[PDB]
Design a protein around this nucleic acid. Structure first.
Lengths: 165, 65, 48, 80, 107, 52, 139, 159, 50, 189, 49, 435
RNA sequence: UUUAAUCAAAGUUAUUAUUAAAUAAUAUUGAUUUUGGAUGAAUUUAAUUUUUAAUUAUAUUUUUGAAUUUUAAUUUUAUUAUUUUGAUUUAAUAUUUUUAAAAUAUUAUAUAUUUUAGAUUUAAAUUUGUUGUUUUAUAUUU
RNA sequence: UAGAUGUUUAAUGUUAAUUAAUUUAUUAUUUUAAUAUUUAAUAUUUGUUUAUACAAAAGUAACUUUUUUUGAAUAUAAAG
């Protein structure tokens, strides 16, 4: 009946507008793949039947499988374009995805060079007031990460509090 | 009619209208085959009602095998 | 096989896993092909 | 059993499928027409055996009327 | 986790049912509806009904507008939802979320 | 994924270790007589309902 | 959004069909106890066997049930062992017993602790001048 | 799993030195005579209902017969067969975890193995009036699910 | 019976004990569900080794 | 939408008039459309009895032919044999019968042991008549001193295996062939 | 639900609106905004049955 | 109660594990003057944070630019709201080599929304019921038992009970008259108000505890599972099944945001432990239900919203069953973008009227600002849409220039037909609507 | 040999299993062996009706005597469904069960706590001139 | 002793984030279907003596090797 067919294949990802009422608050790592291969399946398994339908249906109504008939077969021969708005196609939008992927790979390349500048500019060896713990102690399992910034050993705090010098 | 339970090995009286029995001479009770239904199991071969089936296996794995 | 300790490869008994079921199965029976099947068979996930 | 299932009623066209029965003399009950010979015939073939002048002459429409039953509505496009 | 035995109050499960007669009637959905009052005839049987349609019969075509306060409008042009430069119509109100769309019914 | 068996392992085999289907079903019924009956290796059965 | 009907929060098992409860409260299935080990109302709780009622188990030992019944051939492979989980590793140490001492309790091998009793008792009785003899099924 | 498990007659409590079951076959003349001569039991030779109908087994009966002969399932063997006579294999788990011994024979349809000196038991040989009761030690078929191969170089686990 | 990924010797000690595998619940299912999970014990080793 | 029937009579409560009876069984609720099972449950069409009164089912099956199709000629693949050949003594299944008979004439060793008997006894299949047997002794064993052949169509012997599953030995026939000469068997003694 | 009030006797415009104003109805162009209360569309003059 | 007065503890110590009490000078394992069910120190659940959470410093992070590493700003400017923390939240982002490259502000709207329990409950209460197999909750009914229809005995003359057609719950074959079928249950509804608001107060609690950590990239250099488990040892993600594990919101790098994961990581992200991987958004779709009135009586599945939240979103059950939250900087940008138009409409008017001054409302469409850094997919769709901005030129139905002629129309009412028609230079351009 | 007679039963049993139920949208001339057998009518189930086809609203309106709401995007995906992971996940889990353990108060009659006495409606429902109606329960476990 | 003026269950309980002593608060008087009593030291059973005709339907708990005819095929015991 009415079930909103105009929303099924209209999600951003492939997991929305689909009743997965059979969920489980802990899906094992084997049972998460299957949930992805599942939600990934009933979008192709869904339409790959609605394509087989409408192509096998035109073959029986006497048209081109795509939906073209006699007239819109001639126009393409005359050189006239037949459809009003030719929407960007597979080779079109799977080519734009090679733009915003290629400048970012070049923007993220040069960002290596701009990060090294503003990181080898302000490159102290004694940390500033952030090295205080007059309020709250420090996380020694984190100091192992700031250590690669300076040379002076931040990874050694005395058992007494650190005034932050 | 039907004073006890509905199983064939029940305890009180019954009737053949409500709970029509098959006439089973002697079958095994709920606690196992007593020494009366085994006098057949070693002579007749199977329990005398005919309905039960003679699983003579673990004796065959006792003697022959 | 226990007494001597010999080897045996093919089962000595012709089991019928149908128990007289194939008397009702046409000799041309063979399962169809199902596309886009569900399960992690086509992807052998030895990692998890 | 049936040796030689009979063919459809009026498959005279080469591209469009035959009209439903009754219209051409048969049993009412379907609003479509399906020529298995037409479908199994591929596209490059179905377009081969015709010309543009002819394709526009069997795609021909009579929508408010029937092309076979004179004075009768198109029982392909009726409710039943 | 209790039983609202009428005329007796909340009662424990497993409690006393001796005094829950009319409660076993309400649960069964069975409605006597004070029908033992045969003697006193209610306004129902004696109320002349005007208007073979009804007192407020909203027949098709009846021009029953949905009320929009004017003070709700002047509050949304200084809040900033409505631009007083432009001819304010029904499209903005719906889009400025001034009024919901459940309010708007013909006319 | 054609790997999934297109003839079920539950179906009684062709019984033809030669390498070809032996009469398909036709002949399992002839050899199921050999199953519902008694096999050839069969030695002394133990039960008290015995053939002779 | 009317708040969610979390009756049995999780993760206590489901109720059993009271005279009270919403149309949404999912009770337990008819003819199915809610406390699995309470078959017989006075059934004592099992020792180290908790049926993983719930989602797929994170770590599943061999002595814990999961859509199954108990089976000494599969739920307990070697009774001389005792499987644990140390650092998320299903390790199987030795089984012991809390035998007695001068006033301390020190663990000794649970296979060795039972080799004595199987013998020290069997060697206790056989040197008792009797002849115990039960004849079963007197007609 | 909580308290020790010893011989079933010692802490259980009813300790007999010789149990006798009278429902056996050997003791038939002992019971068939103990009961009175006035206790007549009919259907000694013929049963009442028709017994040549085919019938199933008790619920508990199958449960015992399915565990004994599991290979009657379709394709009980191990999908590739990698265990062969003469292989160099070590056990892994269960009884005697870690012994090394070469296969001598394989029972393929059962997913098990006969391996030298591992899981050896005494195959008693009951005999008729000619030979006395003979006992023979003999290692036993062990499942291939609990053995792995001795790699001729690394001598470790190796599929 | 737990300690961070480096302090793995300092647990409550035990007796003769050998880590069998990780209790991946699918070890119970048929061998084709144990042909998966084959290397998941190998891979997990060097994750807790420093 | 369907709108459920309604059963709360009160202020209106006048089903006596327009109210058509809706006590008519509630088809809408059971709408799960998969047939229930017939209350007198038809047994499986397999014959369970196995004793000496095992009758033969006359009703002609369906898959029976569809397997005897593929066993005289590959049915779904190979084309049907022309009927002139199909209904001929050269139709292979009949061809392999006039030149490759397949019978089993099992003489009971018990009959002619150390004794001397002029009437041996044969466990011949049930299809073989009296004449068909004499022509089988005279042509294959060259025994050509038969006088009269009797027939005792005996049903095969039942038994139950160790588990207790009913089995049977294929039916046979007992043909007391009256020989002309006393024949015995010299059991080595 | 102590929250809600009694459903009124006669319909109100918010009830006639909220009924067909849910998300699930957002595309039901006809019958939206109380089309069943307006006078009908002037039907075609070449209309026939 | 207080039965079992003896026989609990054997009156003896254990061998080498029992210690008597020395005195009040030494400290026992576990003792703490607060009721803690999951007792944790900074060794078992070590928070990955500069400082250690405290009542003094409002959050275990920098509240001021440390000048020994560059400072990044958020993508969208930050305005403080009701539940915001009202203080800067500068969080050092990390590198896959377990370093601290740069420091970055965090939007107080998302990461500084001070938590409340009466709302994170609605997040959990929703999950514990949504994350639930309904179809398993199927029991038989009275009318599915297949028994005789007649009273199984005449109710009077028999010495039995007054019962007919015994197929009821009292019997070991009957079933409940009103049993629990799947479609009777409830999938609760959950709008965008109380989903976002709940979720944003969970990524704040994950900060206030110190279990928050922004990461540059989450790509594995190769799609194996070794590179995953090795990535956690160096970066320090205890992900063993028992020890507390990480939660991986994934959105790609800073310059290359991507709503979908990285096939390298996605394939290596599968490991049987306390690891999760969620979509890089906190908002969710608007709840609808079509079978709201049992209209489709062939349906299976609970009453209520027929648009449930997919399991791989960020919820409140795996927000706490996985202790460490691991956000990528690509995920950050998307959170600040989708929540942007949300925090602005949630401001008072007098304050919403100052945003166009403070550079909050620089519309990438009116050209008043170059286009902001957008997700790889959502920019791809902006290059497509910009590309075809020309094909609608010759038609009067153009969507970018709609109603080109609303200045020359000359509306004319006629009283023979019910028509108000408009003419564009004496030529009728209205369209009689077809039926 | 004397027992004056009486008085008690508490708290454990082997050896074998993977089946049910709901869920999944990819089959289909009837489940239980070889038709007719004359070469022929055995083996026929068809007809414009809520039908193995199963319907997103609260308004109006027929006697207000109960009835009840319209394409959602036109071959687009609410579709009648199982598989080389014990198919998947959830929910449920059992007999053949065959097992089995001990000397305190009294001794001329009123009912357990041992100082010896004292103390007694079996419950539930039913009965609102019957609280005291005239039914129900052997006990055990589910 | 003890909150209070007396009828809407208490629970992270081996964290359904656990792994060797949980010693899990848990049971509906009756309508259920299984067992166990009590009637029960019981009622009823209890096998030393009578007079022989054939079909069919009826069963087939059932076996057969042993003489069916000079008919080819078929079938020769048994309840209600």
């Amino acid at each position: 009946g009415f079930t909103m067919k105009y929303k099924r294949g209209t999600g951003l990802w492939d997991e929305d507008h689909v009743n997965d009422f059979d969920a489980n608050k802990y899906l094992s790592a084997r049972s998460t793949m299957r949930w992805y291969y599942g939600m990934e399946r009933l979008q192709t398994r869904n339409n790959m039947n609605a394509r087989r339908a409408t192509q096998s249906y035109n073959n029986n109504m006497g048209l081109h499988h795509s939906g073209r008939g006699a007239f819109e077969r001639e126009l393409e021969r005359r050189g006239i374009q037949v459809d009003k708005y030719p929407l960007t196609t597979t080779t079109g939008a799977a080519r734009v995805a090679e733009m915003v992927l290629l400048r970012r790979q070049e923007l993220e390349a040069h960002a290596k060079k701009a990060m090294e500048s503003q990181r080898q500019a302000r490159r102290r060896d004694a940390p500033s007031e952030w090295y205080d713990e007059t309020e709250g102690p420090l996380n020694p399992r984190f100091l192992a990460s700031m250590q690669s910034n300076y040379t002076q050993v931040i990874t050694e705090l005395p058992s007494s509090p650190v005034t932050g010098r | 009619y039907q004073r006890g339970s509905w199983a064939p090995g029940s305890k009180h009286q019954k009737h053949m209208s409500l709970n029509p029995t098959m006439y089973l001479y002697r079958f095994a009770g709920p606690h196992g085959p007593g020494p009366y239904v085994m006098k057949y199991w070693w002579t007749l071969g199977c329990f005398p009602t005919g309905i039960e089936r003679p699983f003579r296996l673990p004796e065959f794995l006792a003697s022959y095998q | 096989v226990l007494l001597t300790g010999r080897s045996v490869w093919e089962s000595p008994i012709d089991i019928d896993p149908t128990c007289g079921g194939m008397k009702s199965v046409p000799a041309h029976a063979k399962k169809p092909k199902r596309y886009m099947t569900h399960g992690l068979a086509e992807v052998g996930v030895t990692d998890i | 059993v049936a040796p030689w299932v009979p063919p459809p009623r009026h498959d005279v066209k080469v591209t469009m499928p035959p009209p439903p029965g009754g219209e051409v003399g048969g049993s009412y009950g379907v609003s479509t027409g399906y020529s298995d010979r037409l479908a199994r015939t591929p596209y490059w073939k179905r377009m081969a055996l015709s010309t543009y002048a002819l394709r526009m002459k069997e795609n021909e429409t009579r929508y408010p009327m029937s092309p076979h039953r004179e004075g009768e509505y198109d029982l392909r496009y009726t409710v039943t | 986790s209790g039983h609202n035995v009428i005329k007796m109050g909340w009662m424990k499960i497993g409690g006393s049912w001796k005094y829950s007669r009319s409660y076993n009637d309400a649960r069964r959905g069975f409605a006597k509806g004070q029908w033992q009052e045969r003697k006193m005839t209610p306004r129902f049987m004696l109320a002349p009904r005007v208007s073979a349609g009804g007192p407020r019969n909203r027949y098709e075509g009846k021009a029953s507008f949905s009320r929009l306060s004017l003070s709700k409008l002047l509050w949304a042009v200084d809040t900033g939802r409505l631009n007083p430069n432009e001819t304010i119509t029904l499209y903005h109100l719906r889009n400025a979320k001034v009024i919901a769309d459940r309010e708007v019914v013909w006319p | 994924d054609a790997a999934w068996y297109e003839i079920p392992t539950q179906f009684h085999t062709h019984t033809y270790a030669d390498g070809t289907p032996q009469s398909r079903s036709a002949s399992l019924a002839k050899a199921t007589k050999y199953i519902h009956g008694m096999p050839h290796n069969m030695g002394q059965l133990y039960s008290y309902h015995r053939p002779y | 959004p009317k708040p969610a009907p979390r009756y049995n929060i999780g993760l206590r098992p489901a109720p059993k069909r009271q005279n009270v409860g919403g149309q949404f409260l999912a009770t337990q299935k008819h003819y199915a106890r809610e406390l699995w080990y309470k078959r017989q109302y006075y059934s004592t709780r099992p020792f180290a066997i908790q049926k993983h009622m719930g989602s797929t188990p994170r770590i599943l030992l061999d002595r814990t049930l999961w859509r199954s019944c108990w089976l000494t051939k599969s739920n307990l492979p070697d009774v001389n062992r005792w499987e644990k989980v140390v650092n998320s590793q299903r390790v199987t140490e030795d089984r012991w017993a809390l035998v007695e001492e001068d006033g301390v309790m020190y663990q000794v091998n649970w296979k060795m602790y039972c080799e004595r009793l199987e013998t020290e008792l069997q060697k206790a009785q056989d040197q008792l001048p009797q002849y115990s003899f039960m004849m079963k099924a007197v007609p | 799993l909580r308290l020790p498990k010893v011989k079933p007659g010692l802490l259980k409590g009813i300790y007999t030195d010789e149990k006798i079951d009278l429902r056996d076959r050997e003791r038939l003349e002992l019971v068939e005579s103990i009961r009175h001569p006035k206790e007549r039991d009919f259907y000694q030779d013929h049963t009442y209902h028709n017994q040549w109908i085919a019938r199933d087994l008790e619920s508990h009966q199958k449960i015992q017969i399915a565990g004994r002969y599991p290979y009657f399932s379709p394709d009980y063997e191990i999908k590739p067969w990698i265990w062969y006579p003469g292989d160099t294999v070590e056990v892994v788990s269960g009884e005697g975890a870690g012994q090394r011994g070469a296969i001598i024979a394989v029972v393929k349809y059962k997913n098990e193995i006969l391996v030298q000196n591992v899981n050896v038991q005494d195959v008693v040989i009951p005999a008729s009036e000619t030979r006395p009761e003979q006992v023979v030690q003999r290692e036993h078929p062990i499942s291939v699910l609990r053995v792995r191969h001795v790699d001729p170089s690394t001598n470790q686990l190796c599929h | 019976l737990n300690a961070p990924i480096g302090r793995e010797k300092e647990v409550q000690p035990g007796v003769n004990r050998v880590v069998h595998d990780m209790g991946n619940p699918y070890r119970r299912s048929g061998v084709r569900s144990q042909r998966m999970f084959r290397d998941a014990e190998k891979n997990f080793e060097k994750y807790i080794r420093a | 939408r369907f709108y459920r029937p309604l059963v709360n009579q009160g202020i209106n409560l006048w089903r006596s008039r327009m109210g058509r009876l809706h006590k008519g069984w509630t088809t809408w609720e059971y709408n799960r459309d998969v047939i229930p099972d017939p209350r007198p449950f038809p047994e499986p069409a397999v014959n369970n009895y196995f004793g000496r009164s095992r009758i033969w089912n006359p009703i002609a099956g369906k898959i029976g032919l569809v397997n005897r199709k593929a066993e005289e000629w590959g049915w779904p693949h190979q084309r049907p044999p022309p009927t002139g050949l199909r209904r001929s003594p050269e139709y292979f299944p009949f061809f392999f019968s006039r030149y490759f008979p397949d019978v089993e004439v099992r003489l009971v060793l018990d009959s002619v042991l150390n004794n001397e008997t002029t009437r041996p006894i044969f466990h011949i299949p049930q299809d073989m008549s009296k004449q068909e047997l004499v022509n089988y002794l005279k042509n294959i064993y060259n025994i050509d001193n038969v006088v009269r052949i009797r027939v005792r169509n005996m049903r095969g012997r039942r038994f139950k295996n160790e588990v207790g599953e009913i089995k049977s030995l294929p039916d046979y026939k007992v043909a007391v062939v009256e020989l002309d000469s006393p024949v015995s068997i010299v059991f080595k003694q | 639900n102590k929250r809600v009030q009694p459903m009124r006797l006669r319909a109100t415009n918010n009830d006639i609106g909220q009924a067909s104003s849910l998300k699930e109805w957002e595309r039901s162009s006809d019958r939206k905004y109380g089309a069943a209360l307006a006078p009908p569309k002037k039907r075609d003059f070449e209309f026939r049955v | 109660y207080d039965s079992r007065s003896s026989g609990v503890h054997d009156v003896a110590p254990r061998d080498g594990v029992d210690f008597m009490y020395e005195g009040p000078q030494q400290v026992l394992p576990g003792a703490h003057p607060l009721p803690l069910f999951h007792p944790d120190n900074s060794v078992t659940r070590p928070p990955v944070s500069p400082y250690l959470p405290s009542p003094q410093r409002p959050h275990p992070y920098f509240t001021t630019e440390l000048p020994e590493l560059p400072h990044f700003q958020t993508t969208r400017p930050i305005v403080y709201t009701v539940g915001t923390m009202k203080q800067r939240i500068v969080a050092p982002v990390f590198d896959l080599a377990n370093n601290v490259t740069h420091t970055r502000e965090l939007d107080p709207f998302i990461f500084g929304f001070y938590p409340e329990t009466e709302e994170m409950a609605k997040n959990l209460s929703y999950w514990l019921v949504r994350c639930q197999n309904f179809s398993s909750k199927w029991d038989y009914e009275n009318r599915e038992i297949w028994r005789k229809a007649k009273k199984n005995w005449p109710n009077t003359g028999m010495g039995m009970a007054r019962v007919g057609d015994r197929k009821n719950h009292a019997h070991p074959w009957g079933a409940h008259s009103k049993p629990v079928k799947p479609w009777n249950l409830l999938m609760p509804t959950m709008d965008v108000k109380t989903w976002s608001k709940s979720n944003r107060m969970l990524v704040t609690l994950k900060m206030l505890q110190g279990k928050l950590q922004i990461v540059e990239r989450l790509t594995l250099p190769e799609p194996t599972q070794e590179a995953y488990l090795q990535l956690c040892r160096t970066m320090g993600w205890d992900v063993r099944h028992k020890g507390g594990g990480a939660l991986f919101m994934d959105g790609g790098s800073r310059l290359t945001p991507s709503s979908e994961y990285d096939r390298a990581f996605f394939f290596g992200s599968f490991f049987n432990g306390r690891n999760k991987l969620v979509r890089p958004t906190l908002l969710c779709d608007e709840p609808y239900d079509y079978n709201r009135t049992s209209s489709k009586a062939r349906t299976k599945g609970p009453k209520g919203q027929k648009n449930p939240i997919p399991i791989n979103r960020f919820n409140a059950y795996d927000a706490l069953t996985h202790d460490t939250l691991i956000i990528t900087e690509g995920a950050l940008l998307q959170l600040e973008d989708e929540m942007y138009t949300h925090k602005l409409a949630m401001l008072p008017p007098h304050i919403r009227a100052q945003l166009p001054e403070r550079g909050f409302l620089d519309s990438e469409v009116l050209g008043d600002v170059p286009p902001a850094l957008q997700t790889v997919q959502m920019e791809a769709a902006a290059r497509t849409e910009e590309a075809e901005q020309a094909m609608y030129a010759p038609y009067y139905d153009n969507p970018y220039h709609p109603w080109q002629d609303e200045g020359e129309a000359s509306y004319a009412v006629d009283a023979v037909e019910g028509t108000v028609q408009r003419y564009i230079k004496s030529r009728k351009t209205s369209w009689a609507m077809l039926s």
